[PDB]
Amino acid sequence: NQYIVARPVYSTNAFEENHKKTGRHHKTFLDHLKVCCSCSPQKAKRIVLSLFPIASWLPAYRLKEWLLSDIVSGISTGIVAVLQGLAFALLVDIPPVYGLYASFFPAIIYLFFGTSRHISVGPFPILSMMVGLAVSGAVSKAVPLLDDERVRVAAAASVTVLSGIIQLAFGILRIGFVVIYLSESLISGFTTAAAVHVLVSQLKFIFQLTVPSHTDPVSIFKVLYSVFSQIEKTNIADLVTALIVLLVVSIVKEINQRFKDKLPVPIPIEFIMTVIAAGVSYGCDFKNRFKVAVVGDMNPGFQPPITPDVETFQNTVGDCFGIAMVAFAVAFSVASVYSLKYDYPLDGNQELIALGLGNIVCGVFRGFAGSTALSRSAVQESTGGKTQIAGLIGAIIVLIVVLAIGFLLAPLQKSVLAALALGNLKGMLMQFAEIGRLWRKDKYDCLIWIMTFIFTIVLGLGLGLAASVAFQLLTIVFRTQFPKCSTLANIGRTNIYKNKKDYYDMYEPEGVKIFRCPSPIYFANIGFFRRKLIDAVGFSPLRILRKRNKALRKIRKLQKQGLLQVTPKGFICTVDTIKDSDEELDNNQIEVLDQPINTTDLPFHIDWNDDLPLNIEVPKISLHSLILDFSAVSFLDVSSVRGLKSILQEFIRIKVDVYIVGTDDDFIEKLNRYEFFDGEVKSSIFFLTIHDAVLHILMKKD
Amino acid sequence: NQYIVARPVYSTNAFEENHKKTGRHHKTFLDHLKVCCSCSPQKAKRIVLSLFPIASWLPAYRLKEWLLSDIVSGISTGIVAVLQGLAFALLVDIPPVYGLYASFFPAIIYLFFGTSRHISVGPFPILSMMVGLAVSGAVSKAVPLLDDERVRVAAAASVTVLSGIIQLAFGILRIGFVVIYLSESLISGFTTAAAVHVLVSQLKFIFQLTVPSHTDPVSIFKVLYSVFSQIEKTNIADLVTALIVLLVVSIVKEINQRFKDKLPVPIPIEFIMTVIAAGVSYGCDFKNRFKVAVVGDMNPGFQPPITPDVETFQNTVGDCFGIAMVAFAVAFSVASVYSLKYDYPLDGNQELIALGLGNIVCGVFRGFAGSTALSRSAVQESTGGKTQIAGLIGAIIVLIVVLAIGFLLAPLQKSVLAALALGNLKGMLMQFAEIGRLWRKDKYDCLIWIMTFIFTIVLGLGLGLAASVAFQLLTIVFRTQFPKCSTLANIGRTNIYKNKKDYYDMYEPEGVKIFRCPSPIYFANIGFFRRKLIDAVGFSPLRILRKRNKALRKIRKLQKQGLLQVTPKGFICTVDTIKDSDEELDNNQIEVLDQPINTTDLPFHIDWNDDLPLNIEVPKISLHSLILDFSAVSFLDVSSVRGLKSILQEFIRIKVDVYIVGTDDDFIEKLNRYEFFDGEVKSSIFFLTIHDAVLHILMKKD
């Protein structure tokens, strides 16, 4: 293995001169506007087919290989949807039939507009809690039992419609890339804090206590206080039933995971528990005997369309944005796992449109907002679901319950529903281990997990999320705030330059400094960069320039007085031991000491690093060349270029050659727009590599 | 010029093996605690001298060269401080003597604790507006015309004390670097919007109209409606006087800038206008004759110390955080200008401590918050100010007015003070030109400017700033969100690799792809990076792996059937035209096709890119080596590392050798903590440069 190279030393300009470029186009935004104005029938076709995905997947359905799978998966998911709809309607604090509406409408809409083939569309616990909190606030801000339920049901429907409107708007504006602004640490911390929120929310049903409609901030603490202050009023029958169901479901749930091979089909413990709980409750007349809360009678059939309330929209708009983003983020994440697994394209923009339309329709018909539940989606997929036909079948199961078999669920205890929801919390609850994992791998990510968790707990799920996204953006600045700048040296007398402090027997060419900032330089960075560069070269170039300008002034003074006489050969100290009086420039004249030194007046050059006439003294510097390794400087901003231009001008005015190496062509293209180059800062300072600049410097000094 | 290199090809591990590394001394956090816990006698001296800068600069005072200069600067600044205090107390909507308190107390405290030598400490218009808005809100949120003034004075004093407490806390915690989080575009947009706010705030005094205490959001609009709704009630005498003063001052101000060379000393148009205005008002009895609003009778003396109100603290903590941050940012910017001009160190933490103590004392003695006015600081410096003795003499002038000669300012109209404040707006209002300039230079900074302006106009100064800082952090993600990734090729047949689309006669070694991402890869980035890499290589490695696994499965099945035999020379097709039978794997078995292929059962090796038996087909790829140019990848985060590892694992599983080049040693050190390396992803994939990896690949293929 030999790395052997023989080429010219290349400055970036010299390289462009010797190597012809290719034609480039600006791709004017007007051109983008031009392309948008296509109207080609094929484009129209693709667009409509993009907006109505069912017209493409339905016709290509493999009936023989997919129908039975979707039918079986649909029945399974349909049952889960019914029970989860009831439970999550409890979480919204409205009658449980509206959870059935929330499990029905969004899914039917998704069948026509969704691009995912595996998610089960409907409510999930975090969004139901967020909707319930939005409702409590809306009601509290409304200028003046069943009546209270009516108001909550109306506020929930309005919140749902506004969330769907926001989602649909974001999908029409093609901003489905917003999910990228959420890191995995943020999602982990947020979902752990949200699992704690859900746990606390189920306590009023486990104990059967009456808890006020608390709002954020610190609603979780407010609820905990409400639950524990009145803990003696707890219904024992509710608690025991909840404990038994929770204990049994968890034991059986683990068995399914451990013994997947041994089992022909997983035991459906959650379904078995509800049927048994409902049967026993009905059989032993638990509602009368132990005064247990039960699901109760639900009137069959759907509600008539409700008009969204504009007053509610004004009151809850901030909440709705949080609800819309959370709904989209969760759905997209769940969908992504499946699309990747099954190798099909998932369109983020279409998902926003589909989820948004589903929500608007659901809200109008009195259901609450939901996108997808990870547990329900897993069931649809694990039971063999192939397409969104499984989702349609599931919706039909929900419809049957809503229209004909709703009465069967009447004797089911609320605590049992709450206990099932608690069982699903374990996956999310196990995310506490991530803090330790993150701590070893990356402190910034660990900080993000912790801040997100704290923000989600103290402020609510919605406000906490906004604060968490802001803090996670701030950590990007934390990462690049104090870059580990370095001085580089040559290793092995070849073209390799590394940290001057890392290896033995390194070599700096005499009078050359090579400085590296391993980060992009911008507003939060450039002062630190200047401090580190001045520490690396060992002096401040502006201080040196000011001391030289002062000396030049004294020299000119003595020259005019006569004590000093100019000469082709240096200077004449006509008068020895001369006077010692400083000019003491005023506040309005001191700026002259910062101007480029011009000594043309004097015929000869003043070597500023050699002795000066008449004891005049100025710090001497050995630096004649400064190389800035800009390979890791990704971008620059106006502050960095202003600061940069400033630093470079100062080095150049003190006769030190400056070289910027390791940048690409886009970089110099960008730097040309900033009006960076002029006289006394030229594009000649850019070289290809550190070794190009070093060899150029050595030839100059030769 | 000739770049001539002859060295070995170096993998990062090989280079380290061949070049001994120096002592890697880790820095223990406990050790930091140890160094922080030194308590040496000299260290104590340095700390106390740091907290009491006066004990350091006073003894070194050059009486002969500074005394007179500081005296003249002090008298000049003291006069400006009196008038600016009265005007800015108008902006706080309290009696104007509290502006005199605000000009007195913080300057006296800063004399002892400040590190700057040129700023004039006291109120400025933006902070007075912010304090006035905080008071209005506090008053409203309080639970149940002198009394109104009394309530407003108490709330202003409490807001001042809490702002000072926050500043002092930030200074003790050594967080004076927070100033870096404000870009120049943000500051420009914010100060232009704040100048518009100040302009609108002066209209009730120019016209002499009664305006309610409007709060934010959109307070600027609320006030404008109130002003022009009553425009008919305008006092003309006030207006005319204001216009004349504003006109004369503006014209003469211009002359001072234009005729500095011809002028021995700047004309004091603001003082002359104030003296003439007050004289005519008294002489012609303007208060009675034209019913004009005058400054009125101020009672001489200071107020007794007042106790901060905790209720006001609770109601204003957020406004007080905003006030503290704005005060420190303004003071530090002005002080940094002057400390760079005169080359002396400026301690930001000490600055935070001094301003906090000054604000605490001012608020206790019924003044309001203030850090420094650029207009007054410039006067102190321009008039010859050398040390903070000029600030002491200015505070003595303010004291003389408060105690003895305040009655002289009784007949001065408020419209004149408002007109004087308007004169100072010109510098900030001309910043509107920045939009066009920044548009040409950098559209992200133009966006920061415009959004800061809009946030500060719509929301207020405090909330606008918070929203603007958040948006400016979001623009950093906007910059690095969709990196312009590229494929590189060789130019010149030497170690230079550039964008494959930029030059003619470039060369890619056959089967090698070189991909560059010119940005750090983090969470908002890695999905885009994967998409671009898959577009660059021309296939998805996971799709190729899944198809090969399917082929292998069919093969093994046919081999089981016997229809296929195995030879070191290939596969025997005893039976041809096989019955195609896709296994149609179900949802729970499909993940097997994503696993590393282990065809060790077979004696030979299946050239996956040659033709397979019985028409078994798999997409063929020409890629055998992928080089990732990571020179501009500053940092990685957990999401990016996970995404990176997944990508690499997939490429390795389809037998594509992967190389990462151009990183430094800190990078690999960091990557070792993420548990990135294991079997099948080794540190052998890191090479020094692109040419090292290319030459290694070529030797492997030889």
Ligand SMILES: NC(=O)n1c(O)c(C(=O)c2cccs2)c2cc(Cl)ccc21
């Ligand atoms: N398989 C699986 O994971 N399941 C769940 O997670 C369920 C639930 O979470 C809830 C029901 C009510 C509130 S939560 C669930 C229900 C049924 Cl009927 C069948 C499977 C189920």
Ligand SMILES: NC(=O)n1c(O)c(C(=O)c2cccs2)c2cc(Cl)ccc21
């Ligand atoms: N030189 C300069 O810039 N000056 C200003 O900007 C002044 C003011 O802004 C105000 C006075 C009252 C309300 S504002 C000012 C005042 C005086 Cl007496 C002398 C110079 C001044």
Ligand SMILES: [Cl-]
């Ligand atoms: Cl779930």
Ligand SMILES: [Cl-]
């Ligand atoms: Cl000012």
